């Protein structure tokens, strides 16, 4: 958030120089350093609206990381390593499983402190299991898809 | 065969009619129809099985794989129209038995062929041995080619047996 201000003094304000400055802008409240900042903020212009001049051509240059996504999106490691990934997660999930089993009886409850005893809210099994499942899922499919697609075009 | 609450399906020639019907169904190789009509039939219990006993038994023995109990001795006790079904049944069933043997057994000389093929003569076994290219010397070697084809449990790189791998792998993602 960028704002532009001008600074006047108190004497000027009572004459009525101060209100002119404030007119014709949309406000917005901030407080990054307590009420003293806010008092100065109102006195100035009070968060002046900033818009940006752009056209579609400039935007597109900013969107893409690089040209190389074209190669890279396709690029796979080694199969052995992919197979290892699958194996590592499974083992991890297996541990969490015991903790899920007690939990399922409730674990829809508010407050993490209360949940800690009841449904094993200390190292939450729902969360651990959901993270393990998301990472495993996207990687395995993309790595299979890439290698298999490349093979049919090349061979 | 059954109509109303009871109309009395029972007739004295209901038994004669059922014998020819059931035989017709086996001859055609409408084995399914033999079973599907059967459950509908109660009203054949009163008739009793002497004429009926040939198609029900014939089917059972065939099912079993027996080739010496698939008799056509019985079932000619009326024989005014029964002989016609016996002649054709023998011919259709043998052909099926012959397909069995093609996969089943390595070599047939000239003198065990009658029973195994369920064919009439050994002469005939040789005749079909030119027709289905079984023959190889004075005895057949049909088994080798037939036996080897059966494995299909094997999987060739990239699953295409349960849909191609590319399409399957994208589908697993989509379900999420």
Interchain pair A149, B166: CB under 8 A: yes
DSSP B118: T
Angstrom distance (rounded) from CA A107 to CA A100: 10
Label residue B26 exposed, middle or buried (CB < 10 Å: 0-12, 13-18, 19+).
buried
Neighbours of B119 (CB within 10 A): 22
Domain extent, residue A131, equals: 74-148
For residue A143, the chain B residue with the least C-alpha distance is B169
Interacting residues of B51 by C-beta distance below 8 A, sequence separation 6+: B15, B16, B18, B19, B75, B77, B78, B82
Residue B158 sits at φ, ψ, to 5 deg, of 75, 115
Looking at beta carbons, which residues of chain A come within 8 Å of B169?
Answer: 141, 144-145, 148
Angstrom distance (rounded) from CA A51 to CA B13: 100
Residues B39 and B6: beta-carbon distance below 8 Å: no
* Structure tokens belonging to residue A146: 């890439």
Interchain pair A144, B173: CB under 8 A: no
Residues A44 and A6: beta-carbon distance below 8 Å: yes
Looking at beta carbons, which residues of chain B come within 8 Å of A141?
Answer: 169-170, 172-173
Resolution (A): 12.3
Neighbours of B122 (CB within 10 A): 16
* The length of chain A, given as a count of residues: 155
Which site among B163, B164, B166 would you substitute to test the A interface, given the most A Cβ atoms closer than 10 Å to its Cβ? B166
Bridge partners of B163, per DSSP, are B161
Angstrom distance (rounded) from CA B29 to CA B12: 28
Phi-psi region of A86 (alpha: psi -120 to 50; beta: other; left: phi over 0): alpha
* Structure tokens belonging to residue B147: 């036996």
Which site among A136, A145, A147 would you substitute to test the B interface, given the most B Cβ atoms closer than 10 Å to its Cβ? A145
Determination approach: cryo-EM
Element at B136 (helix H, strand E): none
Angstrom distance (rounded) from CA A103 to CA A120: 6
Bridge partners of B135, per DSSP, are B140
Angstrom distance (rounded) from CA A16 to CA A24: 16
Cα→Cα distances A40→A1, A11, A22, A27, Å: 17, 14, 12, 14
Say what angle helices A79-103 and A125-154 make with each other, to 10 degrees: 160
The residue with tokens 């399922």 is A104
Question: Please, what is the end-to-end C-alpha distance for chain A in angstroms?
Answer: 54
């Amino acid at each position: 958030v960028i704002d532009a201000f001008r600074l006047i003094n108190a004497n000027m304000m009572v004459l009525g120089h101060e209100p002119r400055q404030t007119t014709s802008n949309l406000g917005h409240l901030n407080k990054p350093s307590i009420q003293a900042l806010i008092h100065g903020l109102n006195r100035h212009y009070y968060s002046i609206t900033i818009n940006y001049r752009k056209n579609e051509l400039e935007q597109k240059m900013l969107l893409n990381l690089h040209k190389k996504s074209w190669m890279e999106g396709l690029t796979l490691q080694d199969y052995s390593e992919h197979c290892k990934h699958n194996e590592s997660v499974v083992k991890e999930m297996l541990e969490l499983a015991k903790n899920y089993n007690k939990a399922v009886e409730e674990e829809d409850k508010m407050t993490p402190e209360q949940l800690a005893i009841k449904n094993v809210g200390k190292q939450d099994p729902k969360r651990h299991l959901e993270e393990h499942v998301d990472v495993l899922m996207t990687s395995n499919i993309v790595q299979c898809l890439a290698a298999m697609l490349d093979t049919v075009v090349f061979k | 065969y059954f109509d109303y609450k009871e109309q009395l399906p029972e007739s004295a020639y209901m038994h004669q009619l059922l014998g020819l019907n059931l035989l017709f169904l086996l001859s055609q190789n409408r084995v399914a129809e033999f079973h599907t009509e059967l459950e509908r039939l109660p009203a054949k219990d009163i008739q009793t099985n002497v004429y009926i006993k040939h198609p029900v038994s014939l089917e059972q023995y065939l099912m079993e794989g027996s080739y010496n109990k698939v008799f056509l001795a019985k079932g000619n006790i009326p024989a005014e129209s029964y002989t016609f079904f016996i002649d054709i049944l023998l011919d259709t069933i043998r052909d099926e038995i012959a397909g069995c043997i093609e996969k089943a057994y390595e070599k047939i000389l000239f003198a065990e062929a009658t029973r195994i093929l369920f064919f009439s003569t050994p002469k005939k076994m040789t005749d079909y041995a030119k027709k289905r290219g079984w023959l190889l010397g004075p005895n057949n070697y049909y088994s080798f080619a037939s036996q080897q084809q059966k494995p299909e449990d094997s999987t060739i790189p990239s699953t295409e047996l349960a849909r191609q791998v590319i399409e399957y792998a994208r589908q697993l993602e989509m379900i999420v």
